[PDB]
């Protein structure tokens, strides 16, 4: 029963995340980072134990990931370089 946000939060995804670190050593490092520009909500790991291996770092507020992402990305980290990018649902914000 895990339904992503809906309608109001921030969600960072992260791609080219170096496996060959530990996960715990990575979702604690990619917090960090995020952390040092905005307020870091909560960090999640793709089931993937290869090269494949993404992420989402949730972000308290919206703004906060904007910069994060473009401030963040190619971030050398472990020995690859991670992309963030931001991430759209299906309903917006919808603010007027």
């Known amino acids: ?6 309608g109001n ?5 992260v791609s080219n995340i170096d496996y ?3 996960r715990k050593e990575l979702q604690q490092l990619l917090q960090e980072a995020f952390a040092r520009h905005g307020k870091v909500k909560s960090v999640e790991l793709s089931p993937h134990t290869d090269y494949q291996l993404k992420a989402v770092v949730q972000m308290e507020n919206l703004q906060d990931a904007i910069g994060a992402v473009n401030s963040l990305h190619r971030y050398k980290i472990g020995s690859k370089k991670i992309l963030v990018s931001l ?3 299906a309903s917006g ?4």
């Open 9 to 13: 939060g921030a969600d960072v995804q």
């Open 1 to 6: 029963g895990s339904s992503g946000s809906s």
């Open 93 to 96: 914000p919808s603010s007027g």
């Open 87 to 89: 991430a759209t649902g």
């Open 20 to 22: 060959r670190l530990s």
